């Protein structure tokens, strides 16, 4: 039952920050656990939750949005790719919900499109670590 | 009427037969003596008479019944060897524990504590008892109720020299009532004065049964004449070897001479005639002397002069 990304409702709070998910732009990650689905207000808040040692061993599928086939202000539930096989761009000037703006893609050229259009660098899922999330959020919402 | 009717049993464990073709018949007031050295034939015939084992090739009839019926064991006492009871209980509470199981009346525990001589040492713990004081307790539970058969396995170990005689005095009172019992000892002098008929058995089989007069008549054994208070030893001691009698010298003036029962009269007159002993003791062939004959009768070669 872990194979199914469930859709988002308007009354869907984040797992961490607890506020309303669909009042925000940007891709919205969620985590299907196969014992209960928990959702997130931003993809950087999902990756902040994923890198904790309670959830490294947790067998749960991660699903983020496909921003190569969606408008950035209102992402449809629709195409919702697997988050391990994505291509996150970082460092763009787009205003995400909580963390740094991590636009998720699936085709890596559209990830290279937004990287050159804003001054960012494409990076895979395994290159994401907690030294990078705190570095990228400080450059976005600092100074 | 017979108490124990062992009719041709043969008890085995695996393939080896530890007891082969035992055939006994204990009377209604007799005292039987089971003596065994190598084999478990003494030990297995204990368990066969009780309900502990089952005859694999025969049957036993204790009081005309099977040995494991409840009407049998209410009239059967049994004292095992080296028993130690529950050490935290009292002496009286142990008998009041055993009186409930045999169905005995509770007006007998005060008597039987007095009847074995534990009235002074009752109401103390079993761990503060002697080895002989536990035998007074262990005999007391065998006399609970009105028993018809007693299996005393080594009853006089650790006991006083007087209290072992009063035990046999209590025994010889009981067989006059009609309670035929079984002595099972290893100290063979001491039981021969109170045994009625011996049942000396070998490693496997049953060697010989009968009274002491029958075993002395069947097994031709010599006769010991102990002569104390003679003039010299070697004046007579070199002479009995020439007359054909193995004689030793026991002290500075005392000898014993092993006659051959045809020489016993003429060797008797050579002491009162020649010389002057201060006392003359004549020993019959004892139960212990009959016992070593029957071991020689089936295997069991005698050891050296002093070996074992």
């Amino acid at each position: 039952q872990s194979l199914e990304p469930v859709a988002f409702h308007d009354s869907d709070e984040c797992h961490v920050c607890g506020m309303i998910i669909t009042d925000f732009p940007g891709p919205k990650g969620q985590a299907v656990e196969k014992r209960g689905v928990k959702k997130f207000c931003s993809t950087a808040e999902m990756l902040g939750w994923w890198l904790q040692p309670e959830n490294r061993l947790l067998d749960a599928k991660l699903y983020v949005h496909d921003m190569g086939r969606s408008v950035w202000e209102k992402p449809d539930d629709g195409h919702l790719i697997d988050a391990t096989s994505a291509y996150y761009v970082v460092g763009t000037s787009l205003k995400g919900a909580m963390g740094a703006s991590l636009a998720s893609f699936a085709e890596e050229q559209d990830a290279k499109a937004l990287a050159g259009m804003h001054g960012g660098r494409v990076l895979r899922f395994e290159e994401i670590d907690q030294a990078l999330l705190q570095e990228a959020a400080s450059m976005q919402h600092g100074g | 009427m017979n108490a124990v009717e062992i009719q041709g049993v043969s008890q085995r464990y695996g393939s080896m037969t530890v007891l082969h073709d035992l055939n006994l018949n204990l009377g209604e007031g007799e005292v039987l003596g089971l003596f065994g050295h190598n084999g478990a034939g003494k030990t297995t015939s204990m368990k066969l008479i009780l309900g502990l084992l089952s005859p694999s090739e025969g049957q036993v009839k204790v009081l005309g019944r099977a040995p494991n019926d409840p009407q049998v064991r209410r009239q059967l006492g049994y004292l095992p060897e080296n028993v130690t009871f529950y050490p935290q209980l009292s002496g009286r509470e142990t008998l009041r524990h055993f009186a409930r199981l045999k169905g005995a009346a509770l007006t007998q525990v005060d008597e039987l504590l007095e009847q074995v001589g534990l009235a002074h040492a009752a109401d103390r713990r079993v761990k503060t008892y002697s080895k002989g004081m536990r035998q007074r307790l262990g005999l007391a539970q065998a006399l609970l109720g009105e028993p018809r058969l007693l299996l005393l396995d080594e009853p006089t170990v650790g006991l006083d020299p007087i209290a072992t005689q009063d035990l046999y005095l209590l025994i010889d009172r009981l067989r006059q009532r009609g309670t035929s019992i079984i002595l099972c000892s290893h100290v063979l002098p001491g039981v021969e004065a109170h045994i009625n008929r011996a049942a000396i058995l070998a490693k496997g089989c049953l060697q010989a049964v009968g009274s002491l007069s029958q075993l002395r008549a069947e097994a031709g054994l010599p006769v010991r004449i102990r002569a104390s208070g003679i003039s010299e030893r070697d004046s007579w001691l070199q002479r009995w070897t020439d007359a054909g009698h193995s004689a030793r010298g026991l002290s500075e003036s005392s000898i014993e001479v092993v006659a051959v029962n045809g020489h016993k009269l003429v060797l008797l007159r050579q002491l009162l005639g020649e010389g002057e002993p201060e006392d003359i003791e004549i020993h019959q062939p004892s139960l212990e002397d009959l016992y070593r004959y029957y071991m020689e009768r089936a295997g069991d070669v005698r050891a050296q002069e002093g070996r074992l």
């Binding site: 040692p53 309670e54 907690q130 600092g142 | -």
Partner: protein, 392 residues
């Protein structure tokens, strides 16, 4: 949508100062001129249930003593009670009573506005998803919101990207969030009281701000939630008895790198402090972790000293001594075992949590320190209560 000049204001003083008499009114109203209007206590400006009731577009307006009732509820068009335009700089909204289903005080793009002493009762039936904010502040520099009384709104005092402003002495009751912070760099908030709230203090992505002296009485599931706050300062906060309705955490530090967390008082909660793995190496010294069923939750194996300058925190379950008579304890205090983190790493161990073998494993760690994972210890913990003033 009429204007404020369509009413009957009696001038007490001829310096554009007006005074509205007692008596009810109707409809929306608009301030376009710098009018220092006061009000009698019977000035029930009751709108009909649509539109922003008192829109303000002019600078230097001392609105005082009004009583607004039943404005609109379209949160997308921002149907507020007091809408304050970006051109309406230095507005004072003093001592007002409000009852209506939208925003209480919606300001945006304003400077030096003072929202003082108001009582904003939000709603009763809406599901706390469309009630609107109590005091919404949207990117304002200079604001002074002081000593209000917000009840039953949605997410209390919402604040978005407002740089320098004080939140002093306001009581916030029966709402979803007590004080919400979004990207508010160099902020400040003092002595606020939050009661019966689904999160007492939301501190989301706001750096360099001072959170001091605040109180949180019987909130639900999150005492103070801090996400991505850097160079902050948490001094003197009293977080008491956050029951479930999360399991109840008096302080939940999530991805906050540098901040000074001193002299706080986390009392009678289920979790005293939750420290995530990403938020490490920040000065946490001098607090009082009293009465909590589990003091620190720290799921890591990295060591984390919790004592700057040799002074640590007071712990209620600190079974230690003090031989040389200073304030500090003598033995260090590890708040977490290894078996206290196997329960968090694997939730199936909850079935085995009462076993004697688990109770053996608590004793094996105290006897054989090689199996002790490096935790969240503090050398020199405090022996007495440092927050002797916050209990009053």
């Amino acid at each position: 949508a009429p204007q404020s000049i369509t009413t009957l204001p009696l001038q007490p003083d001829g310096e554009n100062r007006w005074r509205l008499p007692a008596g009810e009114y109707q409809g929306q109203f608009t301030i376009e001129q710098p009018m220092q209007l006061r009000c009698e206590p019977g000035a029930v400006i009751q709108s009909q249930g649509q539109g922003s009731s008192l829109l303000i577009s002019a600078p230097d307006v001392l609105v005082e003593g009004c009583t607004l009732y039943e404005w609109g509820s379209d949160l997308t068009a921002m149907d507020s009670a007091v809408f304050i335009l970006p051109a309406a700089e230095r507005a004072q909204i003093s001592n007002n009573r409000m009852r209506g289903p939208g925003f209480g005080v919606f300001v945006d793009g304003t400077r030096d506005v003072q929202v003082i002493g108001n009582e904003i009762d939000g709603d009763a039936g809406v599901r706390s998803q469309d009630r609107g904010n109590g005091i919404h502040l949207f990117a304002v520099s200079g604001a002074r919101v002081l000593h209000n009384h917000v009840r039953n709104a949605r997410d209390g005092i919402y604040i978005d990207t407002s740089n320098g402003n004080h939140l002093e002495g306001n009581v916030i009751e029966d709402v979803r969030y007590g004080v919400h912070y979004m990207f508010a760099n160099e902020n400040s908030l003092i002595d606020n009281v939050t009661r019966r709230t689904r999160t007492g203090y939301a501190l989301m992505q706001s750096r360099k701000l001072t959170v001091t002296g605040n109180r949180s009485e019987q909130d639900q599931n999150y005492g103070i939630l801090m996400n991505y706050i850097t160079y902050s300062t948490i001094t003197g906060n009293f977080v008491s008895d956050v029951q479930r309705g999360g399991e109840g955490k008096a302080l939940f530090i999530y991805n906050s790198l540098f901040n000074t967390i001193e002299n706080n008082h986390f009392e009678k909660s289920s979790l005293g402090i939750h420290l995530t793995a990403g938020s490490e190496d920040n000065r946490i010294s001098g607090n009082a972790f009293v009465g909590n069923q589990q003091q620190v939750k720290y799921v890591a194996s990295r060591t984390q000293e919790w004592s700057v300058d040799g002074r640590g925190n007071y712990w209620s379950d600190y079974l230690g001594w003090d031989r040389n008579n200073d304030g500090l304890g003598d033995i260090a205090y590890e708040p977490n075992d290894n078996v206290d983190r196997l329960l968090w790493l694997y939730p199936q161990v909850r079935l085995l949590m009462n076993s004697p073998s688990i109770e053996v494993l608590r004793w094996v760690q105290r006897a054989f320190p090689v199996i002790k994972s490096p935790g969240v210890q503090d050398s020199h913990p405090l022996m007495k209560l440092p927050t002797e003033k916050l209990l009053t």
